[PDB]
Amino acid sequence: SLELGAADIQDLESFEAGRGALPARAYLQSDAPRLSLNGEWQFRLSPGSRVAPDDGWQLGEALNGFESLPVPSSWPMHGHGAPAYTNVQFPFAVEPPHVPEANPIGDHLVVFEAGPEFFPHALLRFDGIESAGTVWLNGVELGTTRGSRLAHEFDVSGILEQGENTLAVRVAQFSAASYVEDQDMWWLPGIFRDVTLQARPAAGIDDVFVHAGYDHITGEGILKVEASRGGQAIDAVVRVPELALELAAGTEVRVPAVEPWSAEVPKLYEAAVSAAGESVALQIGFRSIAIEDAQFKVNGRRILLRGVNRHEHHPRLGRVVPRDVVEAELRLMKQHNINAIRTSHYPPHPQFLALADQLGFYVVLECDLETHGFESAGWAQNPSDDPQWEDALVDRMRRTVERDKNHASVVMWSLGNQAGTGRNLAAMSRWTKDRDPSRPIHYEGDWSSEHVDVYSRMYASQAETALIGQGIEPALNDAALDARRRAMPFVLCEYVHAMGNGPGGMSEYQALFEKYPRLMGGFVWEWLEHGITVSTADGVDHYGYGGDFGEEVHDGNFVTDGLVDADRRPRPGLLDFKKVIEPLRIDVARDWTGFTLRNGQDFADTSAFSFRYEVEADGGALDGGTVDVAPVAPQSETVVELPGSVAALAAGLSDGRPAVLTVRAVLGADSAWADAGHEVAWGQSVREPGAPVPPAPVEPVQVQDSELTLGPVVFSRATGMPTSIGGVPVEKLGLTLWWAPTDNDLGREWGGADERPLATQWKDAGLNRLHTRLLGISANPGQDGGETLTVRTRVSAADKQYGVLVDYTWSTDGETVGLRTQVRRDGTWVNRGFEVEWARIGLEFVLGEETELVSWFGQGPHQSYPDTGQGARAGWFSLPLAKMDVEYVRPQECGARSGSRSAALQLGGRTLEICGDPFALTVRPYSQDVLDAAAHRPDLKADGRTYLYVDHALRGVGTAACGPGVLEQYRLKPRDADFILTLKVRS
Amino acid sequence: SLELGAADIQDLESFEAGRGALPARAYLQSDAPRLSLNGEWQFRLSPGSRVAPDDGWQLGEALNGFESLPVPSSWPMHGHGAPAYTNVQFPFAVEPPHVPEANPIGDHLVVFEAGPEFFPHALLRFDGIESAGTVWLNGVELGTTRGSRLAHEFDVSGILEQGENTLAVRVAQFSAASYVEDQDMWWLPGIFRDVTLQARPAAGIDDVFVHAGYDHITGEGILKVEASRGGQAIDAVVRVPELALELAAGTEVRVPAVEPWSAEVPKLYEAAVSAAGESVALQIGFRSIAIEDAQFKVNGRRILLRGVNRHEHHPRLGRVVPRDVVEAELRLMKQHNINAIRTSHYPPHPQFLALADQLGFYVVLECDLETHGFESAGWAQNPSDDPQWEDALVDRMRRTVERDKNHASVVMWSLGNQAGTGRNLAAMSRWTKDRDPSRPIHYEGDWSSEHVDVYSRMYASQAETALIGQGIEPALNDAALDARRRAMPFVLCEYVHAMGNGPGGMSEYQALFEKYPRLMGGFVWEWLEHGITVSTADGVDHYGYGGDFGEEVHDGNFVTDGLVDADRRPRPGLLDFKKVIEPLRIDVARDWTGFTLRNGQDFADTSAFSFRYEVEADGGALDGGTVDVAPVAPQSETVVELPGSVAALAAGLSDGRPAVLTVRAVLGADSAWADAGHEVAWGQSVREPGAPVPPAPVEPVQVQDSELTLGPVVFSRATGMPTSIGGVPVEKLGLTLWWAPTDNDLGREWGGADERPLATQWKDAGLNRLHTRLLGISANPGQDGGETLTVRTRVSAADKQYGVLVDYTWSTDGETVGLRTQVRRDGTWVNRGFEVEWARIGLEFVLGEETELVSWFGQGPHQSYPDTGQGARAGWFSLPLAKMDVEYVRPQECGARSGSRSAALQLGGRTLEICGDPFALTVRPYSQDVLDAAAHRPDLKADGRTYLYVDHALRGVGTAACGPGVLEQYRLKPRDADFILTLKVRS
Ligand SMILES: OC[C@H]1O[C@@](CO)(O[C@H]2O[C@H](CO)[C@@H](O)[C@H](O)[C@H]2O)[C@@H](O)[C@@H]1O
Ligand SMILES: OC[C@H]1O[C@@](CO)(O[C@H]2O[C@H](CO)[C@@H](O)[C@H](O)[C@H]2O)[C@@H](O)[C@@H]1O
Ligand SMILES: OC[C@H]1O[C@@](CO)(O[C@H]2O[C@H](CO)[C@@H](O)[C@H](O)[C@H]2O)[C@@H](O)[C@@H]1O
Ligand code: NA
């Protein structure tokens, strides 16, 4: 037997959990001495175990090939190898427990000083190593770690020396554990969380288990704080000053009155549990969780989960998320009305839990387990059902539960994610129910729900959710399991996939959540895009995604699928989501006399809010103020009268003058997560502008050799298109039916016998390559010697027989231009046996000058499509051209403003104004073909023109990248259509 | 009505044939004065009719915007616009008779002098204008042309002036006629054939119709030469000096003895038909065509068509094919045993016909008609069935037939190609049968064969051809039409699609052609690749194809699908085809005493051939000479004894010494198409070398820290791979299962429920991204203290569970290395529900040095795959590395030499030798991933290494790009396998 490295590889292929570690326990704030070893370490990378040197480097002397590296780190974020993104696919051959030969081996070393306070007893703590670590101290092997997002501690008593010590950690990227860590995210090896030296004084406390229930009938707290040392219960004193409590650890007491903890009102009581040699500081939130009548209840009430799935990602540091970024993003979530977080799909940094307790989120704390890439072989060799993996998988769940069991914010334990069904998941569930019966068990991966307490699905359609909400979904084959599941409350652990332009269809889910008590709510997939900052040639910065780092196998931009970008800048989807889940409903009376107010919170009344009104018109604000609202109880409603001035202003409005009344609920005072005046909810009533009246056609057509003139518009006699409007140069005018595919349009819709993505259906149909034939140009009798001009055209694509006849009828009184567009199908829009859907029915104006400013009356400020835009409110908006765009990582259709009544483009010295019945407005400095061709933002280039899109109809954007496509009501099937616009140019 | 250009466009949209032209007639060699106007014209291009100037340019004075252009020309070959390639797709919206707005308009003008010999009467002749011409002479409109590959003539009497004249031609690229000219080829507008001024003397001859039949019972010729003027029969004298004939035009006579015309023996008699004012020169071939007993017969005998489809293309001049290129390519065809040409899919240049008469080809003369792009709408609006198109389509057939009706080589008229079924095709057939009953009618497009005389298909499988050959194919629904068709002979007008590496499966068709009299044979698709020469940055030259010229819609490299490249360099497919269709069969006796000889010709005996033998061995030729063969009649056979020296040499051969006896039939004398010694047919008998005997394993394994040594091979202990063999650096060794997809592998195979191209099946299966895990390395007891070395590995791909266990067992005596490779499936090779096929079972050696020379014993010199290589003969070959490659336009797998027994690579100072039971050999200076990624030849780059492929098994290459995929016997399904090689290095 002559091959090198067999012992190292045999360890990496082990099914066992780590070796040599102390018992799993809680992460506890203690007064015991501690020393963080975070900082600059020395690092050496080898390409595999068989060539990783056995050169005594653990002793730290004469190190050849080492360089400095910050720890904690994801080491491919610092030039060592490269990030690699796969979704489901494993990046190595599926032969568990075997590892590939190409397996980055990172040797880590740091020298540190240990003072006398770490003797006789201390330990070393590692809060995360991806995926397999071997640890030596002063050349002595302490043990190994498995479970990349889990904590390990090693006793160093009698190995640590007073004074200088050398810590050495060999980290393998891949191991047998990789087979159970197949989350959809970047593969990033490293020592990516804290390394800590902790003294273990005699007569100390190793573990604590807080039990703090709430009796919602009596208002009492039920408190018991367990404390142990070496796995044995110990004498300790628990003190809770604010509740006047001094009690023994280990005894259950009834606190006469406590204020209960919820995400809405995250009341925490400071406490300490003390033994002779060590004191632990705790924050106690009293709350009880119960499943009753097919509802998930906290403190006696059904709650609504307004959730997101939170991965840990940083665009420059990988899995290392700085604390200030964590604090800021949780405040951002609260500021967008989120009340719940799922830790997809592993425990977070241990510091996250106290922030969730404090700011207030319902947390689904999920174990580090995912075997998704076994699905493609029918789950053959799945670790979840393989007896050899039982100890490893129970260990993951044990470490998960033990670390975070004291936190009020944790309201469910999750076994893992997309790991199939199997006996080891049952073992993990049984262990958890025995250890901590206070929290229900979640696991979507087994739809029978045999070993869980809630029925969880991901991306179930709105239709299926409505059936589940009514308790009428199809039965399981097993009657006993069906009865159990039908009595469970239902949660969407992932829904309304937020990739690219979208997500559409959020309102339809939310209406069901509000209607059906069995529905717990849902967690958007996902909070953040995992973009990785990259540099172009001129040092331009942009986000990269799958395949941008040389991966042989990858899943492209599927890692950029979030409500916020990697730097936590909101995508439009977050602005819409904030509105969808707003915790108050404000319905403003049509006559502006008042508003109906429903408090949708579960526990809090409306006393935290100030209720403000404003009336706005073309010239700005006309009236505004605040109104007193007696506190509305949770789940109750009332009618609030507005001051008489408001309705009087509505009564005096001249007909056709637009005006908007907005009623807003804002924070009356600073909270922990935002300042006074922060907006939480709103409602509006709009007095719409009258339809624009088309101008009298009193100008005639002036005919020249090659041009025609009709008031302010010049036409080409060869094309029939305008070449200038009031001096503004027009390079092209034509019909649009297509847009640059969104991420959703690139996904298959599994619903019918056509599984081509919409984008492919469009390409096959030629919708991206329309051409127009001129049929004729004629002038017609207008008014008082005036003439209208009708240009007849037909739009089709090469090699297709279907088309649309498009007639433009132009009229002018000399200042205002009337444009009537009529579209008529000529032949059936069917291609490859399937009917062709359209993205829109609209016009593209290509103008020969650049636009500096875009203003409009309609919905804003951000984009809106038929099935999105909930956060776009009625008003007057004005933006520089650049701010009309949306910086999605892969450029795609975006930036449309649906519901526009008027628009004004400032092209240098002129202003082009458009009016009509509702239209969507888009303005870009590059063409649709440039947008579609661009894979990253630097691929976009301005060409000196303005591309102006005026759409009479748009389709929805849906969530077809993962989950439901566009709902039926928002699909755009070929039809005949006609629409009127007016245009005019101002200097 | 204000749009510009409506009259021009109305003409372009006309359904009528041209206007103003003289009656269609034959192309005739006359003594009437003539003046070619070919030469430098003046040319102006406009982008469409509506902007094409009406500026009096036809008068030729004050021309603004004109530049010189050669005529004839395809004008996009000279910088004016660009070539555009589509296969089926129309490049404009399918709204016949309407034309797109983007429609290149080329104005052509030339000034010329007309002497007195062109008065009083002359005409102007245009032999081709694509697609619509309007002609003016001295400002007077003569008429228009429709039918791009058809001739038009215009009477200029009284318009032509003595002295200077100005000819003006406006040419539209697209017209209504484009709908009926949808051939799979480049769209190339232009005046692309001759322009001629011809005097029409009084008492002349306008048309001639030669009837020259052959009575094969009596040997008589049946001759009647019709002559007419102004459409009326005239008095003229026919003289045929060689047959001692002087007869009146219009009278049928019986010539007592004539020598008949065939492609094999193209006897032509010179003749002249003379009136008082004009004499026409003719070449008369006597031959009669008959369909009898479901056979296509010429001169009383069934013939075998050994055919190609000939387009007219030139890589720098487009549709203009210089005469010297025509002459050379027809000689090249004869030199590759071709005897038949289909003029796909329009009449050729008129000069082609006399060359075919002279050199000898059976010609299928096809009308300019193809409506293929209507198929995708179920043939809705197909012109072939639209009454408005009757006159246009009958006109095309009339001009087709009238031009070429005097040529003996034309043995069938074809109505067109892929034009569906319809009443206008029936009209064309009826017109043709009435006008010229002497030639059968061909048209594949209507499978019922209602209006034809032969049953024609394209790309029918070998299986279906065998059924048709036996007369047992499934019946038509209509019993009367079925009876008619079952009594027709059967031709493949297109088969064994020759795109890229291939075509495979030619032998299986040919065996059927020889077995079944109903089978007429077939015409390969196609003779030439339509590559267009393009230049890179350093002025490197390469061929471009579809999409390389900016086309919005195109069909890529489907235009490069020929037996020869655009410069008429043979592809390997032509070398194989020559052998498949060789007209003699030579079967050499195993004992080398003689050979069996079958004469497969239809008319000629074997007297044109010299029969040569040669015996070759490792040291070169050992014996050779000629042998006398009494002439063998067509379709007969004989046994020919070889001189005794040959068998004596075979008897004396020491066992295991390779030697090859080749018997060849060459031209005994110069022919019109090749020189004496040109090889026509051959056969071989090979005395195979014994299996190489593996060396005694008497060397032990020498173990060092990181390396192992076993005689001349050094191994890495980390990988188990050799790092040098006898000093030759080895960078990598591993198993191969994949190759860079051929054009055929990129085509769908419609046969089963998996319609993914093989290339896609491979990509989905990960076959292009294999990885290898090392399982162990061990030494084992050899002989006399010697050791063998077994390296155990497993090959798989990321995210897959299937693999193959590959064990390498190495042995050496110190000079020769034995390598045994054993492959064993581990798990089922199924992916996405379908079994994964392999391209090969082989080894890739990546050597760290360049190869200058590759030599081998096996088959050669050119490439061979399991279902190709018929033209590769047994022998010893040696080539510089560059000449191992094949210059396909899109690089792809190619260059394998199947059937190799030994190989020698010269890498500088060393020679690496490989021996084994048969293996395929490939050697390249770049990797497979470079080959697969390259879209054009300049994308290939040498990297300083040698990539050496030794394959124990290969799959076939088939013709899946269009037609049958790999036949079952040549498919390579996953299996277990083992194979032995020996290696040794010489300095
Ligand atoms: O295919 C549905 C079926 O598969 C199971 C495991 O057998 O769940 C797996 O597949 C689901 C569908 O892709 C995933 O949603 C789930 O996460 C995964 O574990 C069954 O539970 C389910 O009935
Ligand atoms: O970082 C969270 C932090 O944001 C602050 C200050 O920026 O909150 C204010 O700022 C937000 C920026 O959009 C406002 O949207 C928000 O309404 C406002 O309170 C801090 O107060 C908060 O703690
Ligand atoms: O161009 C046709 C022309 O080729 C010639 C001379 O090249 O024929 C000879 O050349 C061929 C080149 O490969 C040989 O393969 C062929 O065997 C040989 O006769 C002319 O004779 C022929 O007319
Ligand atoms: Na609910």
Ligand code: NA
């Ligand atoms: Na994702």
Ligand code: NA
């Ligand atoms: Na108040």
Ligand code: NA
């Ligand atoms: Na035959």
Ligand code: NA
């Ligand atoms: Na082709």
